[PDB]
Design an enzyme around this catalytic site. Structure first.
Site, PDB file in Angstrom:
ATOM      1  N   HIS A 165      83.441  -6.581   1.062  1.00  0.00           N
ATOM      2  CA  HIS A 165      83.408  -7.692   0.095  1.00  0.00           C
ATOM      3  C   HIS A 165      82.340  -8.764   0.395  1.00  0.00           C
ATOM      4  O   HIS A 165      81.849  -9.438  -0.527  1.00  0.00           O
ATOM      5  CB  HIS A 165      84.787  -8.360  -0.031  1.00  0.00           C
ATOM      6  N   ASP A 386      76.312   5.774 -16.233  1.00  0.00           N
ATOM      7  CA  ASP A 386      75.871   7.141 -16.530  1.00  0.00           C
ATOM      8  C   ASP A 386      74.683   7.489 -15.629  1.00  0.00           C
ATOM      9  O   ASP A 386      73.613   6.906 -15.770  1.00  0.00           O
ATOM     10  CB  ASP A 386      75.464   7.227 -18.016  1.00  0.00           C
TER      11      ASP A 386
END
Ligand SMILES: CC(C)(COP(=O)(O)OP(=O)(O)OC[C@@H]1O[C@@H](n2cnc3c(N)ncnc32)[C@@H](O)[C@H]1OP(=O)(O)O)[C@H](O)C(=O)NCCC(=O)NCCSC(=O)CC(=O)O
Length: 440
Positions: A165, A386
């Site tokens: 994080h 994608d």
């Protein structure tokens, strides 16, 4: 099984990146001792092993290598020093690389990409370990980002992404993934990204050094070295993972019910109403005593002055509500949950608006018997990532298995529906499914 085909290391291209640092802020220091974030993207495509090896492996390596030259902290390490003075930072050194594992799994992909309850532990070897720390005399160095690409022969591909994080928030991850996929889709070429894409902003424009030292002091940096341990999820477990869908039509009807019953509630959104509904389900499922429910807030746009979306790193706040469980059950419980979330969120946003920068009160006021924190960003469409094979069939945030957390994201045959991910013990899941479905 899990067969590991290749354990590789991926670096930026030769003669591109020199040694680079990134200085961190209190927003980043907050996460110093946090467990890893594990995310999966499942793609459907009738891919063979030979084809996986021949084009997918080279393409993943190449497109990632190129992306890294623009996103240096992803290939860097978190460096933590034992002197309570010297601040942790992200350092990239020439020679640094990202661990990228290529694997093959013989599980049926259709049994993993469904929404119905599936064993939580079937997902753990689809996600990479964050990686071993490097312990030196003057410091510890922790990897920030790792990748696993898994072939499901003749069925598809999972991309497993693990990060620390401290690297950055969901917006940072989004920005990196946008670039990586653009670079991959256009044949391992960054020209479209450099011309049309959003480049990360490394300017250190958040300057609150007094908060910096307070959050660092709170992170206990002098003992970090001695305390730090790897936190990888591993089986076996009886816990089940399920995805629950709130369609836009259901959300709108829930909003309307809140606005009718509570006409002066100062904050009502698709998000608060989704949280209120799930919160109510969790209350009915647990039948406990006292509950806290909370979620992170992207503060970029709420800063004074506002911070660019492309700002690299963390800029996250939080908001929580606490309520007796009996007040949260049923149709009226849903209403109360929406009230409490709406009021707390409105208060938090006003406090930001008026400058406020910060935020064992639980010991005094009452220890909650359940605590839930939301993972996920319905308005960042990770469902459009994608790499060249199409949009993801399913996204799963595996790291919610670690603690009291659920995930909330958009769907991506619809940006207006919400998918809610839950991992809970087998016995609790049967009731929860009934509770969720019946209440709708
Ligand atoms: C606090 C939020 C969740 C609130 O979400 P919202 O959807 O309500 O907020 P929004 O700005 O998109 O607003 C959407 C629309 O504005 C709302 N709205 C605004 N003002 C309002 C008011 N006065 N009264 C009622 N509604 C109001 C609604 O109209 C809502 O409608 P509509 O119903 O049309 O939407 C926040 O926007 C946010 O920061 N989200 C991102 C969190 C994030 O970055 N993730 C964590 C980072 S990393 C991490 O720690 C974990 C992780 O990986 O996730």
């Amino acid at each position: 099984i899990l067969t590991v085909l290749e354990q590789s290391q991926v670096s930026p291209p030769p003669d591109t990146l020199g040694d680079k640092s990134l200085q961190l802020t209190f927003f980043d220091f907050f996460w110093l001792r946090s467990p890893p974030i594990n995310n999966l993207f499942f793609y459907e495509l009738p891919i063979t092993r030979s084809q996986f090896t021949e084009t997918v492996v080279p393409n993943i390596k190449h497109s990632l290598s190129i992306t890294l030259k623009h996103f240096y902290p992803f290939v860097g390490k978190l460096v933590v020093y034992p002197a309570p003075t010297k601040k942790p930072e992200i350092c990239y050194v020439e020679g640094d690389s990202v661990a990228v594992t290529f694997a093959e799994c013989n599980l049926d992909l259709n049994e993993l990409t469904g929404n119905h309850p599936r064993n939580c532990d079937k997902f753990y070897d689809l996600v990479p370990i964050l990686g071993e720390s490097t312990r030196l005399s003057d410091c510890i160095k922790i990897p920030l980002f790792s990748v696993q690409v898994t072939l499901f022969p003749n069925q598809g591909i999972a991309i497993g992404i693990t990060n620390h994080h401290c690297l950055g928030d969901a917006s940072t991850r989004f920005c990196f993934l946008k670039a990586w996929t653009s670079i991959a889709r256009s044949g391992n070429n960054d020209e479209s990204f450099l011309a049309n894409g959003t480049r990360p902003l490394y300017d250190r424009i958040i300057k609150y050094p007094m908060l910096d030292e307070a959050y660092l002091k709170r992170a206990k940096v002098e003992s970090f070295n001695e305390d730090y341990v790897t936190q990888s999820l591993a089986g076996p477990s009886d816990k089940l993972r399920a995805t629950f869908i709130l369609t836009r039509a259901v959300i709108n009807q829930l909003k309307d019910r809140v606005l009718a019953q509570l006409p002066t509630l100062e904050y009502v959104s698709s998000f608060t109403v989704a949280c209120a509904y799930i919160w109510s389900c969790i209350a009915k499922s647990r039948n406990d005593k006292l509950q806290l429910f909370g979620f992170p807030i992207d503060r970029r746009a709420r800063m004074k002055p506002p911070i660019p979306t492309a700002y690299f790193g963390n800029c996250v706040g939080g908001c929580a509500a606490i309520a007796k469980t009996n007040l949260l059950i049923g149709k009226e419980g849903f209403i109360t949950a929406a009230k409490l979330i709406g009021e707390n969120l409105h208060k938090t946003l006003t406090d930001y608006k008026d400058g406020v920068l910060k935020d064992n009160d639980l010991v005094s006021e009452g220890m909650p018997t359940t605590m839930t924190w939301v993972s996920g960003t319905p308005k960042l469409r990770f469902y459009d990532m994608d790499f060249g094979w199409g949009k993801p069939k399913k996204l799963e945030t595996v790291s919610i298995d670690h603690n009291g957390a659920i995930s909330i994201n958009s769907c991506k045959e619809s940006n207006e529906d919400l998918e809610i991910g839950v991992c809970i013990s087998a016995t609790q899941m049967e009731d929860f499914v009934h509770i969720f479905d019946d209440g709708l």
